[PDB]
Amino acid sequence: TKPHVNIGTIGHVDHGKTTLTAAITKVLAEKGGAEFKAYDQIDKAPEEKARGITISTAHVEYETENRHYAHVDCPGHADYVKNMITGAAQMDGAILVVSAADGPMPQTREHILLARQVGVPYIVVFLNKVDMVDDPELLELVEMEVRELLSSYDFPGDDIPIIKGSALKALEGDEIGEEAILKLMDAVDSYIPEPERAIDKPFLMPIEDVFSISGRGTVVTGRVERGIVKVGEEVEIVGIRDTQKTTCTGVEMFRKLLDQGQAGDNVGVLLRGTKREDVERGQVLAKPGSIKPHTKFEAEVYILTKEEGGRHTPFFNNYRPQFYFRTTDVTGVVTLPEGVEMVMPGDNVTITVELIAPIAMEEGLRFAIREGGRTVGAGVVSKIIE
Numbered sequence: 001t002k003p004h005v006n007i008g009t010i011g012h013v014d015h016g017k018t019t020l021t022a023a024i025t026k027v028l029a030e031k032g033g034a035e036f037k038a039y040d041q042i043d044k045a046p047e048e049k050a051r052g053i054t055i056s057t058a059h060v061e062y063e064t065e066n067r068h069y070a071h072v073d074c075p076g077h078a079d080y081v082k083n084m085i086t087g088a089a090q091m092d093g094a095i096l097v098v099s100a101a102d103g104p105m106p107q108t109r110e111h112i113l114l115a116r117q118v119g120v121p122y123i124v125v126f127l128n129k130v131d132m133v134d135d136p137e138l139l140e141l142v143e144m145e146v147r148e149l150l151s152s153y154d155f156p157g158d159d160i161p162i163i164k165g166s167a168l169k170a171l172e173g174d175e176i177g178e179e180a181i182l183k184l185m186d187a188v189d190s191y192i193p194e195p196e197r198a199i200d201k202p203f204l205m206p207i208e209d210v211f212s213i214s215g216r217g218t219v220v221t222g223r224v225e226r227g228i229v230k231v232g233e234e235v236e237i238v239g240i241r242d243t244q245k246t247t248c249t250g251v252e253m254f255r256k257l258l259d260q261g262q263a264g265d266n267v268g269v270l271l272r273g274t275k276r277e278d279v280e281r282g283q284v285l286a287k288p289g290s291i292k293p294h295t296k297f298e299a300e301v302y303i304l305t306k307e308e309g310g311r312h313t314p315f316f317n318n319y320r321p322q323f324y325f326r327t328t329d330v331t332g333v334v335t336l337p338e339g340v341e342m343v344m345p346g347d348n349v350t351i352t353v354e355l356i357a358p359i360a361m362e363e364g365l366r367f368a369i370r371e372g373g374r375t376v377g378a379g380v381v382s383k384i385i386e
């Protein structure tokens with residue numbers, strides 16, 4: 001029945017992200033929509049290790065009248081960096097927590113910048129610790145500050161809901177505290193839209209393997225990432241070489257002929273007229289017009305540390321690694337932003353990349369940076385250039 005939304009608390013350390021998360025689960029538990037997870041349980045977040053990288057993330061779930069939420073919260077700034085860039089945590093929206101007594105702090109800025117770079121589409125703000133601020137005008141001035149900062153990263157600062165409260169008082173069962181948590185959750189319900197179903201997006205399928213079979217022609221295999229491909233419809237073959245257009249004449253799985261393949265399906269797709277030598281791993285099938293090939297882009301990247309399997313020395317301007325996009329490596333040259341001389345292991349930064357061959361790409365596409373077949377970085381395309 002209820003639509004599902006993924007969110008998380010972001011913001012500077014000590015501003016009350018965890019207290020707020022705990023208060024949400026408490027106040028919703030009390031309305032019959034969650035198990036109360038106490039502060040210590042959320043704060044002592046399990047470390048999860050995946051692809052060399054350890055991230056501490058608390059996962060909590062709750063529901064309002066309208067919606068079901070999965071909510072993430074992390075102890076440290078570095079967990080946010082890694083989750084948001086690697087996509088180990090996805091957010092359809094974020095609750096930005098700012099201490100009203102401190103105002104925005106450097107990770108308040110960094111998390112907003114990250115939200116922009118990795119495509120978090122909406123922010124709601126909880127201005128926390130108002131029990132520490134007795135002056136209403138000071139409160140308004142902090143709020144105005146948060147709005148200016150949000151707008152400076154192109155979020156709609158004038159329209160973003162900002163709820164003022166004390167997460168700590170809510171935890172202590174103060175009624176005014178609790179009402180703020182409920183106003184926060186109403187704003188989340190109404191402002192953060194439920195994301196588009198993968199099935200409704202334009203068809204896209206990364207090609208993993210290509211086959212030329214006697215009396216069948218050219219077959220490509222992979223997983224449909226999004227949308228639906230139907231026998232008889234046209235598809236573009238995008239990336240690496242000039243775009244080509246053809247007709248899907250078949251979709252199949254082991255011992256199963258299909259009329260179509262949808263998001264999540266691992267299928268073989270028969271391409272009418274297409275020569276095996278014109279298709280390769282690293283291209284995508286797509287809805288015609290829906291995605292273009294590019295060589296040049298900006299990305300937010302996280303560079304692994306030595307302990308994660310990464311480099312143990314910095315790189316510099318013109319570094320020339322591989323970029324693993326979906327299924328294949330393409331070499332590219334890295335340009336660093338003005339004011340950045342070097343990128344250390346464990347840093348995150350925005351870079352410009354120029355690949356030696358085009359890839360079907362769009363904002364939000366993730367990739368790995370590799371050196372000699374070893375992953376040294378994780379990125380997400382933040383802007384297409386030209």
Ligand SMILES: Nc1nc2c(ncn2[C@@H]2O[C@H](COP(=O)(O)OP(=O)(O)O)[C@@H](O)[C@H]2O)c(=O)[nH]1
Nearest residue numbers: 013014015016017018019128129166167168169
């Ligand atoms: N006075 C006050 N303190 C708070 C409030 N919310 C959190 N704190 C305290 O600020 C500290 C940091 O809170 P925490 O939720 O761990 O911050 P996080 O680092 O953002 O997750 C803890 O001592 C909290 O109890 C609040 O509304 N008022």
Ligand SMILES: [Mg+2]
Nearest residue numbers: 017018074075
């Ligand atoms: Mg915390």
